[PDB]
Design a protein around this nucleic acid. Structure first.
Ligand SMILES: [Mg+2]
Ligand SMILES: [Mg+2]
Ligand SMILES: [Mg+2]
Ligand SMILES: [Mg+2]
Ligand SMILES: [Mg+2]
Ligand SMILES: [Mg+2]
Ligand SMILES: [Mg+2]
Ligand SMILES: [Mg+2]
Ligand SMILES: [Mg+2]
Ligand SMILES: [Mg+2]
Ligand SMILES: [Mg+2]
Length: 73
RNA sequence: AAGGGGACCAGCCUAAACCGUCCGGCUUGUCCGGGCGGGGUCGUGGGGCCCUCGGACCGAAUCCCCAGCCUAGCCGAAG
């Protein structure tokens, strides 16, 4: 089963990285502890939504710093 | 079993594309989920979004009234 890696763990990957593991391991170990959530059609919209929200903040921050860069010097 | 001949007819509501409304989750959102309204119900596919042109008659399976009907009866010829 596909899941999203909530907390960065060892020998698995990056925080937020999608990883497919044996479902029983996640049903007995990962999900009850709140360390993982399986990848649905909705949390893809929510993961694209938070990544694109960090991008909506980033594109504002760096562009404002570049406009102020055009103001200074 | 198909079919033919008869009895009888009546076709519809939703899930979901779409919008709106509130809700509450914290993970702060063009986020998700859960409610309600609207929008929708197709097979020579059909609808949703975008735009173009065009813009009364049907009709309940629900309701009301009216004919009609059963739960008593009545008249009813002449030794
Ligand atoms: Mg590994
Ligand atoms: Mg705890
Ligand atoms: Mg810098
Ligand atoms: Mg300087
Ligand atoms: Mg057969
Ligand atoms: Mg037949
Ligand atoms: Mg009805
Ligand atoms: Mg009559
Ligand atoms: Mg009669
Ligand atoms: Mg009577
Ligand atoms: Mg007489």
């Amino acid at each position: 089963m596909k899941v999203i890696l909530l907390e960065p763990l060892e020998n698995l990957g990056d925080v937020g990285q999608v990883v497919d593991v044996k479902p029983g391991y996640a049903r007995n170990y990962l999900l009850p502890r709140g360390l993982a959530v399986l990848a649905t059609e909705s949390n893809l919209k929510a993961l694209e939504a938070r990544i694109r929200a960090q991008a909506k903040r980033l594109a504002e921050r760096k562009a404002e710093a570049e406009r102020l860069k055009e103001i200074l010097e």
